[model samples]
Target chain A: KLKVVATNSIIADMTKAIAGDKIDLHSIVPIGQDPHEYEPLPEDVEKTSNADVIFYNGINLEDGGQAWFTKLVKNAQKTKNKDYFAVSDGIDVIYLEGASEKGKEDPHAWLNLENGIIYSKNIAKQLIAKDPKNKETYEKNLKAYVAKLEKLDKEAKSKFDAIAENKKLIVTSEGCFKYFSKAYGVPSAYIWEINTEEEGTPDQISSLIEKLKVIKPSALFVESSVDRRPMETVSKDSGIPIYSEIFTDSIAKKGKPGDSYYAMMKWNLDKISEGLAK
Target chain B: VQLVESGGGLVQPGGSLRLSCAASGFTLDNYAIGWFRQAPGKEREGVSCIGLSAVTTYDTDSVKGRFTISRDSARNTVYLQMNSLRPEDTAVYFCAAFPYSDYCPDSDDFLQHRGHGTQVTVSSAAG
Candidate 1:
C-alpha cells in the first residue's frame, strides 16, 4: 500500500480527502490538539519512517516546521520534492501588522477555502506523479473535491455579503484567521499570533480591545482548540457577547459540528454570517 | 464510486469483535483500507481511520485504545479487530478506502461511497 504521513490532523484529513483509498494515511497530531506545539510520539516516528510521501504545511506552521519532520525524511532517506510535499508551497500568505508572528508567513492558509483548493490540488498532483498507475482516479477525486470547495468559497462570499461591512470584522483568539479574513474581505484580530503564551497576556488583548472598540463587531469568537479565557475577557469588556467558538485550528469530533473538512468550512461560514448579520 | 461493505451485528462486551469489509470493486493491493466505529445509535461519529498500516487515530478523546486496521488483497477484505471492547464501543462501524481521487466513506453525501455499516456491541467486563 502507498503509505502517507501528514504532520497534523488537518493536513492528514486533506490528504485523505484527495488520495481516497489510494494511500495509507496517518496523522501525527490527534484531533483538536494544538498542532503548533505537538511533539511526535514513537509511533509517529514509525509512520514517518515508513511513509512513501510525507505531506505537511510548509512555513513554520508545525511550530518548528523544519525540526518537526525534516530529520524524519533524512532518516528515511527519501528525496525532497519526490517523497515529501508541502501543501502550502503555492499559497500567498498573510503578514500581520502588529503581532508576534508579524512579517512571518501566517501558516493557516487552509482556513481560506481558496488556499484549501491549492493544498488539495498540490496533493493530487504530487500523488499522480508519485504513483502514476492510479493517476486517473486521483485526478478525478481532486476535480470533484475542488468543485465542492469552490462551491464553499462562493457560499462564504455570498454569506458574508449579508452582513454589514462594519460587523464583518472577525475577532478570534488566534490570528490564524488572517488568510480567511483576506479571502472574504473581512478584517480579523486575534489575542495573539498562533498561541496564547505571551500574546494572551493583557498586552495584545488590550491592543485588540482598542480595535474592537473602533470596529464595533456584533459578536466575538474564539477558536475551538484555543482557550476561551482571552476572547471571553475581550467580549465582556467590549459588551459584545461571544456568539460561538469557530473551528479554526482543528475540526471538531463528528456530530459536534465542523466534523469533516467541508463541514468545518461550512460551519465557519454559517457561524460567521450568523454572528455578524445580526 | 463503489466502497467496501461490512455486516452489522450484536457482539458481547469485553469480548473481541472482528469485523470484515469486502471491497471487490477495484484492485488495490497498493491502496489503503480503513475501519471506523461509532457509539451505537449515537449522533457523534469519530473521524480517525485506522489505515491499512495499522496506524490508528481517533477524533474523539475517549476512543484511545488498541485496535487493528489491515487489508488482505488476496481475500479482497479489510478487517478490524477491537479487543477489550467496552459497552460504549457499541456503534455502527464502517470500512472505507480513499483512492487517488476521494476517500469513499460511509455517508449519504460526499463520503457516502464508503462501505455499508456494521454494528458492533461491546459488553461490560462484568456484564
Candidate 2:
C-alpha cells in the first residue's frame, strides 16, 4: 500500500486515478486554493513524512516557496524514506522573460493541455516503475485519462477555431496563462506577472493600454482568484467587453462549475468560446 | 586547510591564475567540492569541478582547456586554476558540493548544495 502525497488537487486527482485501490492519496492544497501562497501546516509536514512519494509541480511554480519545500524534503529525508518528483519534466516551458529573474523560468506548464498530457504520462511511468505489480492497472487508467484529455483537446480546438476572427489574442490582468497561450498559439499580453504582487503600475498599465490599442482584441479576460476591478478598468478604457474568468493558477470553489482539472479546463474553454465566438 | 590563489585580487586574462577552497566544517573525505563562476549581473554558472580525489578534475562547456580544478585531501583544500583567462571569466567564483545529503545513509542519493560565492573579476585592470 503506497502512501502518496500530492501538492495540489489536480495532482491528487490524477494520482488517485492512476493508483486506484493500490495507493492512499492525499492533497496538500484543497480545491479553490492557490498553491503559490499556500502555507504548509504541521499536519502537512506530518502527512508528507509518512508518505512514500511526494510529487511537486516543479519549475518554481510553488511561488518563492520552493526553497522551503526543499528544506522540508531534506528534513523529511532524515526520518523517512521518500522520493520527490517534479512533474513538469519533458514539457517545453513557456518563458516569462519579463517577470522571471535572470536565468529563472516560469513554472506554470500545467496550464497547457499538451504539457498536462506529458505530466500524466510521466506520472504513470513513475508509478508503474515504482510498483510493477500494478503496472497494468496504472497503464489502463492512464490510457483512459489520456483519451478524455484528447476529447477535451479536440473540443477546445474546434471551439477556438469557430471564433472566426482568427485574431488569436488574449489580453488579461494576470500573466499566469503564458502556457495556455503558447499551447493554443494565442498571443497573450498581461498587466502583471503574478497576482500576489501589486496591481499594474501606471507605466505597466499605460504600456498594456498601448498594446491593446494596436491589437484591438475582441475581449479581455480576468482570473477568478483575483480582483476584477483592474480588468474592468482596462476593459472600460479599451472599449472591449470583460469576458468571463479564466482558470490558470487555482481551481474553482467546491460545488462550482470547475471543481476538478477536467472541469476547470472545460469551464475555461466554454468561457473563451462564448466570448470569442460572439 | 588553507586556500591560496596565484594573485591576491582579480587576475587578468592571459595571466596565470590559481584559487583554492579549504574545508573545515566537515571532513574532506565525506564531501565533494567544486568551483563555479558568475558573470557580472548574472547568476552563478558551473565553471570547473572536481571530486573527492585530488587528481580528478572536470570542466563545464564554458570552461575550456584554460580552466582546471584539483584537490589536495591531505591539506583539505580544493583548487581552481585558470590559464590564459578571458574577459568572460570575470565573475564571481563559488565552491559547492555535488548534490549530496549529509544525513543520507544511501550514498548514491547524495546531492550537492552550494555555499556563498566569491566575486572574481578578470578585467583589463583590477577596479
Candidate 3:
C-alpha cells in the first residue's frame, strides 16, 4: 500500500485528486490551520515515518524551508522507504523585490489558476512515476482536473474583463495576492512583507497609505487566515471602503463558504471581480 | 502537542516530586528530553535530563528534596510540576528535547533554532 504524506491540506487535496483510491493520503497541516507557525507534533514524526512518499510545497512555505523538510526527513526513522518531492518546481514563481530573502521568491504560486493547473499536472506525473502501477488512473484524473483548471482560468479572465482596467488596483493587507495581480495584469500593493512576520509597522503603513493616495485604488481587501486589524486601519485612515475578504494561507473553517481549494479560489475571484467592478 | 502534569503541582520540602517530559517529534524511542530552571535575575540552567518513554530520573543538588522527573509516552508534552512552592521556585521552568544530531548534522547549530522558553514562576500563597 502506498502511503502519501503532504505538508498542507491544499497539496493533500491535489494529491488525492490525482491518486484517487490508489494511495492513502494524509496532510500534516489540517484544514483552516496556518502552516507558517505550526510546530510539528510528535505524531507527525510517526506519520511521516510510515509514509512511502512525502510531498511538500517548496519555496519556504513551510515553517522553515527546504532545510526544515530535509531535517524532518533525515530524523524520521523510516529511512528506507521515504522520498521527498518538491511540488512547486517549474511553475512561474513571483519574485517580490525589496523583501526579505525568504520572501524574495513567493511560495504562493497556487494562487494563480494557470499555475494551479501546472501543480495538478506535476503532482500527477510524480505519483505516476513513483507508483507505476497506478499510472493509468493518475493520467485520467489529471486530464479531468486540468480541464477544470482551464475553465477556471477562462472564467477568471472574463470576470476581470468586465471591470475597467484602470480600476484593477488591488490593495490588500498582506502580500498573498502578488501572483493574482501578475496573472490578471492588475497593479497591487500590500501592507506587510509576509504573513509570518508582524503586522504593518508605522513606516510600512505610512508608505502604503502614500501609495494608496497616488493609486487611489477601487477597493481594499484582507485575507481570512489573518487578523483584519491592519486592513481595518488602512481603510479607516485612507478613507477607502474595505470591499471583501479572501482565503490564502489556510482554508476556511469546515462548512463555511470557500472552505475547499476550489471554492476558496472561486470565492476570491468573485470577490476580486466584485471589488473592481464597483 | 501532548503536555502532561507529572503530579499535582504542590509538594512539601524534603519530599520527592517527579515531572515527566514526553513528545513525538522524530523518534520517541531515540531522543532525550532535558529540564531547565530559570532563576530570577539569571539565565536558565539545565536541572536534569532523561531518555524518552523510559522511567529515567535525574536529581540536582540545587533541586533539593521536592523535585522529581518522569515521563509518559502516550502524551507528546512533557511535565515539570514542582512540589512545595518556595522562594526558590519563583523561577521559570522549561523542557526541551535534544536534537537528533546523528540524523540531522546541522542540529549542533543552536543559534538557528532556539527552543521556546516556558515561564513557570512559583509564588507562595497567604494563609
Candidate 4:
C-alpha cells in the first residue's frame, strides 16, 4: 500500500475522505493537537520521510516552536509531492477579523465549507498524481465529498439567516472562525488573534474585555484545543456566558459528534447558532 | 511504553468527561504522564500530571480551574479527567508520560511519548 501522511488532524480528515482506505494514511499531528508549535520526534521524521504522499496546512500554521515539516522532509530527503502536500496551498486568505490585525491571514480557512471544497480538490489531485492506479477511486470519493461540502455551505447560510443580526455576534477564545464569520455572516470576537500569540496574558484579556464592553455579545465561545480560562475571564468580566465548544483546529476521534468534517461543521454551526441566538 | 489513547464522549459545561490512554510497548510504572495540547492553529495547551496515587493534582496555572489528572497502574494506563468543562475547554488533548516521579511530575519531561491525542468538546447545555 502507498503511504500517506497529513501534518495535522484537519488535513488528515480531508485526506481520509478522498483517499479512503486505499492508502496507508497517517497523521503527524494527532487529533486535537497543534501544528504550529509541534516538535516532531524521531518516529514522526521517519513517517514523513517514508510517506508516498503528505498533506499539511501552510501559512505559518506549522511555523511554530519547531518547524518540524522542514526537518521531517529534510530528514526523509524527499521533495514536495515526491512526498508532501501543503493542503492549504492555494486558499484565498481571509485576513484577521479586527482592524488592528489586518494583513494577517486566519489559517482556519477549512472551517469555511467552501474552502473545504478547495481542500477536497487538492487532496484528490495529489492522491491521483501519487497513485494513478487509484485515479478512479480518488475521483469518485472527491465528488461525493464535494457534494457534502456544498450542502454544508447551504446549511451554514441558513444558520446565519436564523440568528437575528444583533445576536449573530460570536465571541470566542481564539480569534479563529474569521472565515466562518465571513462565509456565514456571524460577527466574531476573540481574545487572541492566533493560537500561538501570547495567549491568556493579562493584556489579551483586558483588551478583549474592553472590546466586548462595546460589542456586548450574548455569549462567548472557545475552540476545541485551547485553555478556556481566558474566555472564562472575559465571560466573568463581560457578563457573557462561554457557550459551546467549536471544532476549528482538528476533527474528533471516531464515533464522536464531530469526528468527520461534515459532522464537525454541523456541530459548529448548531453551536454557534445557539450561542448567538436571542 | 507506547500507548494508544482514544477520545470520545460529549459533555456540557459543568459536566465531567474522562478518557484513558493504554500502554502496550513498555512498563507503565516507569513513566509519569503529562497531559498536553499546543497553541499552533490549534490552542496549544499544557495541563498537569499525576502518578503513584497522588492527590491534589499538580497543575499548570491555566488548568487550575477545571483540569485534573490521575492514573490506573494496574491497567498500564493513565487517565485524564476534566471537570466543569466549558466550550473553551473544547480542544485536542494529548497524554504524555515521562520518567517517574511519585507525585507532582514536571511538564517539560512529559509529552515525548504522546499517545495519539483525543479531542474533547463541551456543549452549550447546563445539565
lDDT of model 2 at position A44: 78
TM-score of chain A of each: 0.91, 0.89, 0.90, 0.89
Q: How are the candidates ranked when ordered by lDDT, highest leading?
A: 4, 1, 2, 3
Alpha-carbon interface RMSD for all candidates, in angstroms: 10.0, 20.6, 18.7, 16.5
Task: Report per-candidate DockQ.
Answer: 0.04, 0.01, 0.01, 0.02
Q: Of all true interface contacts, what fraction is found in model 3?
A: 0.00
lDDT tens digits, residue span A208-271, model 3: 8888777666788888777888888878977588887877876554224454455567677777
Error of 3 at A205 (Å): 1.8
For residues A1-278, write the lDDT of model 1, one tens digit per residue: 68888887777766777766578988886787766666567788788777788888867665354565665666656777767778787787765454544466667888888888898888777777888876667777778788878987998887887678877888887677888887898988777766424657778878888887777888888788767877778888765899987787775553335655766776677788888888
When 3 and 4 are scored with lDDT, the better candidate is 4
Best by DockQ: 1
Q: Of the candidates numbered 1 and 2, which has the greater DockQ value?
A: 1
Superposition error at B80 for model 2 (Å): 73
A235-255: candidate 4 lDDT, tens digit per residue:
886667777788877767642
Q: What is the TM-score of each candidate against the true structure?
A: 0.67, 0.63, 0.64, 0.64
Model 1 chain A, poorest ten-residue lDDT window? A251-260
In lDDT terms, which candidate is top? Answer: 4
lDDT of each: 0.69, 0.66, 0.64, 0.70
- Residue A85: error of model 1 in Å? 1.3
Better of 1 and 4 by TM-score: 1
DockQ, candidate 4, comes to 0.02
Worst 10 residues of 4 chain A by lDDT: A96-105
lDDT winner between 1 and 4, please give it.
4
Evaluated at residue A203, the lDDT of candidate 4 is: 83
